[PDB]
Amino acid sequence: MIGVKELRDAFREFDTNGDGEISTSELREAMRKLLGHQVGHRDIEEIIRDVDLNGDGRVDFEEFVRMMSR
Ligand SMILES: [Ca+2]
Ligand SMILES: [Ca+2]
C-alpha cells in the first residue's frame, strides 16, 4: 500500500537482466546511465563496495532497501 510498490520498481530497473540480484557488472551498467556516458575513467569498483556492505558480494531485495536508507 504505497511504499513497497515503487520500491520493487527501482529494484527491477537495475536488475533488468534478471537473476533477481545486482552484481558488480550490473549496477555498473546503471551507473553510466545515472551519470551519463563515460568511455574510460574506471572507479566503480568503489561504488560496489558501498552497496556490498553485506559481504555477500551481491545486492538482494532487503539490501536494496537498506542501501536507499541513510
Ligand atoms: Ca542481475
Ligand atoms: Ca551486500
Curated annotation (Swiss-Prot):
- Which positions in this protein are listed as binding Ca(2+) 3? D52, N54, D56, R58, E63
Q: What is the effect of changing D15A?
A: Loss of binding to ITPRs
Domain of life of the native organism: Eukaryota
Please state every residue range assigned to the domain named EF-hand.
2-37, 39-70
Q: What is the effect of changing D52A?
A: Loss of binding to ITPRs
PTM field: Phosphorylated. The phosphorylation regulates the activity.
Where is it localised? Cytoplasm, Cytoskeleton; Cytoplasm, Perinuclear region; Cell membrane; Golgi apparatus
Expressed, tissue-wise, as follows: Retina and brain. Somatodendritic compartment of neurons. Calbrain was found exclusively in brain where it is abundant in the hippocampus, habenular area in the epithalamus and in the cerebellum.
**Sites of the modification Phosphoserine?**
S23
State where Ca(2+) 2 binds: D15, N17, D19, E21, E26, L53, G57, D60
Job of this protein: Modulates calcium-dependent activity of inositol 1,4,5-triphosphate receptors (ITPRs). Inhibits agonist-induced intracellular calcium signaling. Enhances inactivation and does not support calcium-dependent facilitation of voltage-dependent P/Q-type calcium channels. Causes calcium-dependent facilitation and inhibits inactivation of L-type calcium channels by binding to the same sites as calmodulin in the C-terminal domain of CACNA1C, but has an opposite effect on channel function. Suppresses the calcium-dependent inactivation of CACNA1D. Inhibits TRPC5 channels.
Domain comment from the record reads as follows: EF-1 binds magnesium constitutively under physiological conditions, EF-3 and EF-4 bind calcium cooperatively and EF-2 binds neither calcium nor magnesium.
Assembly, per entry: Homodimer; when bound to calcium or magnesium. Interacts (via C-terminus) with ITPR1, ITPR2 and ITPR3. This binding is calcium dependent and the interaction correlates with calcium concentration. An additional calcium-independent interaction with the N-terminus of ITPR1 results in a decreased InsP(3) binding to the receptor. Interacts with CACNA1A (via C-terminal CDB motif) in the pre- and postsynaptic membranes. Interacts with CACNA1C (via C-terminal C and IQ motifs).
Indicate what this protein is called per its UniProt record: Calcium-binding protein 1
Q: In which organism is this protein found?
A: Homo sapiens (Human)
Q: Which gene underlies this protein?
A: CABP1
